[PDB]
């Protein structure tokens, strides 16, 4: 029963500290997605500027 | 009528089973 | 997401001054109306249909302004007289107006047996009418259309002279007429006949726009002439009228269209001299092999054996219809051990006890 | 209030929970049979009643027949659901119903007359004070600390999928499927005569359910476990019986559940549990699709299959559309989640306002409880 | 209940049902009730009766994709014009969907959307709105028969009486250069002082009305007797062929609870779309179609 | 009840031989295949776009012969090569008929900087391919969709000498072929543009179908001069995306990855005590 | 008993009114134990016209 | 011993899990970088 007990508070704390990482992998995919369709805009713009 | 009725019917659990 | 509504509705009304014929006359017409609506040549509100109940009372039934014709339910709609006015207030709570009701009273003062009244505005009839000659004989649909009048149309009817104008160019026997820049108007003894010449003209006025438009003048169009073409009974347009009817019926709308010829649905079934025939024309129970009989004293009671020699009953039942029916219900279990341990412990203290004696003995003492 | 508290009685279609408003936990959870005997008792003195209710009946299974008197969330024995709240108001708990309030929950979708008829004989015979009738699936959501959301509910009788929006229960998206673990019980009988193991009377259904809550996993991918089964033993595992005989499940362990996603095996045509809560979503309007799928709670008896969360990830995600924030949340107590939202409901100061006095169902009928609680 | 998510379409037009399915799913009434500091009771109702028009006029087809706005007044103080943002199609306008600007093109409200608006689309409504103080409701509209009737030499004929309740007609020929100040000079010079229905050469159908009934009346009129003429002058072949409805005398002999003269049509298909479920909230003038069973 | 089925398949079939940009052309073309039925231009299957995947690789996507628009998904597309044999097959158990590929061979063939063509076949566009001056720009779409190349059809290309007079009448910037009697062909870079061009294009031809039937003549018709006629968005990214969307919106799982995001999504009200979500 | 008939377009009430009679009547009523009364060439034609 | 069991195993997979989500982060922000970089060099020319 006691190592029952510490194995559940382990899970709780470590599977919110999972939520926090997956939020900071959302952040960095739209990080991704607005600098590669920029890239792509300034590609089709064919600009020399 | 009803033989050939049968003879059709397998012929379509052959169909269908594999 | 269910726009359908039932089109009788005289169920729910409960009111009114109604005639013998006024619930079929009411059904038709509004069936007229969905189904023109459903078809999609009139989507709007206007007075496009007017129908005659009594040949000697008048009181024509029209349409309320401003309802849509899929909206359209038999109680909603406005008896009125000759002249227009209104002698009968519809169910629905709308603001009234019988302008165009009155072209109409102009086409029943003129011919007295005529009963439907039809008035079309769809695009192809319009373009028909605006066109500078007649509708030409290039279809089969026109062709069965028959005979018709072409009067021209000032948007106008209120004065005398329009009215009486109309009479004489309409004809005495006529069942079109054209009213140019304006559409066609139909004219029926019977709902069904001038649904049926509606439907034909239709038809036909689209297949003479699209072959005038793409043949491009007269000359192309090889038209016919007309001259040369030429339960009880059936009265022209009673089949199709009953049929849409009857698929209207299943569609779950309510009409009050009684048939002429009924429907009959049977699957019937083929006889195979394969198939064999149909060929069909709690309690628990505890037997005694025996009975006996009561037989008095030769008191004390006596029973008696009643052996098979004598016709005697063969199988007496006993029905016991619950379970644990020989133990009492209310029972506690301590007792029984207890009164087990009473009398078992006195093994153990080894008792002087003897049986009891008959009183007899205690008597003599 | 402070002097009494309020009595949480949860009513599941296989088991029955009752305890007090703002306790942790419930006090008394049973099973909801009530047996009969069967056969002819002979011993005199030992005591037998008419009909045993609850665990004493299922503590004596091979001498009674176990009737459920809630059968598919739809009462079928009123008498008996009075025994039922008999056994639980003065053997469970040992208290009395005149001097406390009473909490009881109830399906989403239910006949008018079932409601009317839980007022009359809870205000007729009990002669309790105050009642509420409140959704099940609602309460889930008080007990998960959100207000809106996809509830996901599926218990003995039905399992039936609702939204929630702030504490709104949408009543045209409110989907029904007649997949319960009774089915699942049954359909695991089906598939174990195949080993060779008859069971066959209602005794047995209950070694049948514990087989089944005891021995069970959802698969991942079906069509490569069936291969894994096939080609190995390492999947089998053996389960002892009450007579002492050992049976081996063997492949049919992740054959049970698989039900509920195709029901098809059961012969019902109707769509999976992902569909069903697919087609929830799509019911609703536009603007709160995307915090629906950001926000799913499961719950119920039948939701505690291992596995079943990153399977039922998987088949929403395959149906959801692209870059879509999907996340399932299912607590670890989620088949004791609605005594826990009905005792947090019944804990607050202006919840008091929803309790039907004695003098309002005796002025209005039992027709009282639709008007006051919506 | 017992309704599929979709509708099934029918052999031909799949955009009637698909919006449907699509208008049963989103209201256009997207207010409830929340916070709007800047909203009036008659800046919601136009709202939402824009956003009605603009499912409206999807529903009969009389759309080319986005290429085409539908503008309106506030009728505030100053200015502030509402318009659907640049890029959502019209079965996706609600009411706080829709974007309030400026006379020319400054955008004082964003709305609910991240879209802008499109500032070249604008100019168009801008000059007839710099033109006349009087009108309300703009709508530009292209139907395929609209168009071949506005790219023939004569234009409109008075062959049927809802030409001739249509009025006077203005013209503006196809400059298709878009000179900005002058070309809003000479749409006000083609305008006139006085006109119901503007019909821009080659592109497209405008009406203008004081309010959002009269502009559906108005441009209603002129498409069927657009669609009358298609038929009939294709046939004709020439004015020898065809007769010509006179306007004086026509219009000489044809002539609260109580209606105007566009909103009968604009309530019927308002009852309509609200059956349909669209629930848009639109102040009937009679609550009912029937009266209550007794 | 439903013709609804999920446009993107790639998830569950979980197989064939893919491009590294090859899952999004597909889905993409499956959309076009979607879109061409929705408005009722085309029902049955005679094989109307076509796209190149890589420049080098070839490999052209196209439809399978026997399946109509509706029922096209993302992995019943079929990779063929320039002459019409089968590179790679998907789960579409149909015979292979690349007859119809032989029409926009040759323009593969012809101009590489193409890689979407949309072959029409509606009544409207076939008319005025029979229509012997070809399109009159008297509308604002006419003008719109460009300049035209025109070109005799006899119905066979597998000629080796046609092929020649098909790029000779092409042109080298030619955008739109207008084959006599045989509706017209559409010439893009991208999906977009083609869609667009096809889109204006048919409303043009609906259009001047009507004006020539109403007009009777030429003279009674106007005619503005094609020397008078004469951030970025680029010619139809707008109004693809918004058409994606709606389709979102209703339910179809259309892959097209979006450039921006629609709604802000205000941040909504948060309570402490939540379970933490996901399942890890 | 509710037919549940589809919305139609404006110009579509054929195809509408089409499609509900199908889904309430279908065109293959022999299915069952009538299937056998009819000869199996004769049952395929009548389903197919 | 069953649950207990269970719950090891349960954080066992749980534990390896976020390792490797960490190393995906910060793995996919290095990406984000280089990308960042040649975006700039694009720009520039
Ligand atoms: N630990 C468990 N593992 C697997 N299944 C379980 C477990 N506990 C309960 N169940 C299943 O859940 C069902 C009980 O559901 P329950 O929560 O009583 O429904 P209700 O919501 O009506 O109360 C039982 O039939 C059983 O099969």
Avoid at chain 3, 352 to 358: N, V
Avoid at chain 4, 16 to 44: E, L, T, Y
Avoid at chain 5, 81 to 104: C, H
Wanted: proline share 5%; hydrophobic share 40%.
């Amino acid at each position: 029963e006691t190592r029952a007990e510490f194995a559940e508070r382990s899970v709780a704390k470590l599977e919110k500290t999972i939520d926090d990482l997956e939020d900071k992998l959302k952040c960095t995919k739209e990080e991704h997605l607005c600098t590669q369709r920029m890239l792509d805009q300034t590609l089709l713009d064919l600009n020399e500027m | 009528s009803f033989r050939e009725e049968l003879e059709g019917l397998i012929q379509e659990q052959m169909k269908k089973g594999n | 997401f269910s726009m359908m509504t039932p089109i009788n509705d005289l169920h729910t009304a409960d009111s009114l001054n109604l005639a013998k014929g006024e619930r079929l006359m009411r059904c038709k017409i509004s069936s007229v109306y969905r189904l023109l609506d459903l078809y999609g040549w009139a989507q709007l509100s206007d007075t496009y249909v007017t129908l005659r109940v009594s040949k000697e009372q008048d009181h024509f039934l029209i349409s309320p302004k401003g309802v849509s014709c899929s909206e359209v339910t038999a109680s909603s709609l406005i008896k009125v007289n000759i002249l227009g006015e209104v002698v009968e207030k519809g169910s629905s709570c709308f603001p009234v107006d019988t302008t165009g009701f009155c072209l109409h009273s102009a086409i029943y003062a003129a011919r007295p047996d005529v009963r439907c009244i039809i008035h079309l505005h769809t695009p192809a009839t319009a373009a028909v009418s605006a066109m500078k000659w007649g509708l030409l004989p290039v279809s089969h649909n026109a062709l069965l259309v028959g005979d018709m009048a072409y009067f021209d149309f000032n948007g106008e009817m209120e004065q005398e002279a329009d009215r009486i104008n109309l009479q004489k160019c309409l004809g005495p026997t006529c069942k079109i007429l054209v009213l140019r820049n304006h559409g066609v108007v139909a004219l029926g003894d019977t709902v069904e006949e001038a649904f049926y010449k509606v439907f034909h003209l239709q038809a036909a006025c689209e297949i003479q726009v699209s072959a005038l438009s793409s043949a491009g003048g007269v000359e192309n169009l090889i038209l016919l002439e007309q001259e040369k073409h030429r339960m009880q009974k059936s009265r022209l347009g009673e089949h199709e009228f009953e049929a849409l009817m009857r698929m209207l019926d299943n569609l779950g709308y309510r009409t009050g269209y009684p048939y002429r010829y009924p429907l009959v649905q049977e699957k019937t079934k083929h006889k195979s001299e394969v198939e064999i025939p149909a060929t069909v024309t709690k309690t628990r129970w505890l037997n005694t092999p025996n009975t006996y009989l009561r037989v008095n004293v030769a008191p004390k009671t006596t029973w008696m054996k009643a052996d098979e020699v004598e016709k005697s009953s063969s199988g007496m039942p006993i029905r016991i219809e619950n379970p644990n029916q020989f133990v009492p219900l209310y029972t506690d279990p301590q007792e029984v051990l207890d009164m087990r341990n009473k009398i078992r412990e006195q093994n153990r203290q080894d008792v002087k006890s003897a049986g009891p004696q008959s009183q007899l003995l205690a008597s003599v003492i | 209030d402070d002097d009494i508290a309020a009595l949480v009685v949860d009513n599941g279609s296989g088991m029955c929970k009752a305890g007090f408003a703002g306790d942790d936990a419930p006090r008394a959870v049973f099973p909801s049979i009530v047996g009969r005997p069967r056969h002819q008792g002979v011993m005199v003195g030992m005591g037998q009643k008419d009909s045993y209710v609850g665990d004493e009946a299922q503590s004596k299974r091979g001498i009674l027949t176990l009737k459920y008197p809630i059968e598919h969330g739809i009462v079928t024995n009123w008498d008996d659901m009075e025994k039922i709240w008999h056994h639980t108001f003065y053997n469970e708990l040992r208290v009395a119903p005149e001097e406390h309030p009473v909490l009881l929950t109830e399906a989403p979708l239910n006949p008018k007359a079932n409601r009317e008829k839980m007022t009359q004989i809870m205000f007729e015979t009990f002669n309790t004070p105050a009642m509420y009738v409140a959704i099940q699936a609602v309460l889930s959501l008080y007990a998960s600390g959100r207000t809106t959301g996809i509830v996901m509910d599926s218990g003995d009788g039905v399992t039936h999928t609702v939204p929630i929006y702030e504490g709104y229960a949408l009543p045209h998206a409110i989907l029904r499927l007649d997949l319960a673990g009774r089915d699942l019980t049954d359909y695991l009988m089906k598939i174990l005569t195949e080993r060779g193991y008859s069971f066959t009377t209602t005794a047995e259904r209950e070694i049948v359910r514990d087989i089944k809550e005891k021995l069970c996993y959802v698969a991942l991918d079906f069509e490569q476990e069936m291969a894994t089964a096939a080609s190995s033993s390492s999947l089998e595992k053996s389960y002892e019986l009450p007579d002492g005989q050992v049976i081996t499940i063997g492949n049919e362990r992740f054959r049970c559940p698989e039900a509920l996603f195709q029901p098809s095996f059961l012969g019902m045509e109707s769509c999976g549990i992902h569909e069903t809560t697919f087609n929830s979503i799509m019911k609703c309007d536009v603007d709160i699709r995307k915090d629906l799928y950001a926000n799913t709670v499961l719950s119920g008896g039948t939701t505690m299959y291992p596995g079943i969360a990153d399977r039922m990830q998987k088949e929403i995600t395959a149906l959801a559309p692209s870059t879509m924030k999907i996340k399932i949340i299912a607590p670890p107590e989620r088949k004791y989640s609605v005594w826990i939202g009905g005792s947090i409901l019944a804990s607050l100061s202006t919840f008091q306002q929803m309790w039907i006095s004695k003098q309002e169902y005796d002025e209005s009928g039992p027709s009282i409880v639709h008007r006051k609680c919506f | 209940t017992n309704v599929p998510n979709v509708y099934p379409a029918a052999p031909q037009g799949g955009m009637a049902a698909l919006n449907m399915s699509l208008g049963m799913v989103t209201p256009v009434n997207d207010l409830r009730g929340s916070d709007s500091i800047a909203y009036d009771k008659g800046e919601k109702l136009l709202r939402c009766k824009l956003a009605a028009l603009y499912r409206l006029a999807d529903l009969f087809g009389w759309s080319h994709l986005i290429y085409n706005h539908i503008t309106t007044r506030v009728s505030s103080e100053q200015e502030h014009f509402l318009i659907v943002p640049f890029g959502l199609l019209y079965s996706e306008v609600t009411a706080s969907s829709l974007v309030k600007i400026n006379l020319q093109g400054d955008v004082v409200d964003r709305g609910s959307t991240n879209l802008g608006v499109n500032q070249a689309g604008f100019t168009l409504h801008s000059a007839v709105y710099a033109a006349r103080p009087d009108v309300k409701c703009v709508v530009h509209i292209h139907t395929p028969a609209g168009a071949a009737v506005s790219a023939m030499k004569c234009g409109l004929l008075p062959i049927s009486p809802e030409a001739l309740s249509l009025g006077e007609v203005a013209y503006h020929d196809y400059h298709g250069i878009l000179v900005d100040e002058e070309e809003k000079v000479l749409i006000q010079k083609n305008l006139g002082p006085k006109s119901k229905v503007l019909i821009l050469r080659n592109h497209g159908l405008v009406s203008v009305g004081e309010s959002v009934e009269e502009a559906f009346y108005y441009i209603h009129n002129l498409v069927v007797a657009c669609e009358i003429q298609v038929r009939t002058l294709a046939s004709a072949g020439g004015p020898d062929n065809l007769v010509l409805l006179d306007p004086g005398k026509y219009k000489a002999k044809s002539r609260p609870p109580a209606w105007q003269i566009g909103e009968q049509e604009f309530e019927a298909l308002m009852r309509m779309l609200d059956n349909l479920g669209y629930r848009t909230g639109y102040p009937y003038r009679y609550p009912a179609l029937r009266e209550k069973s007794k």
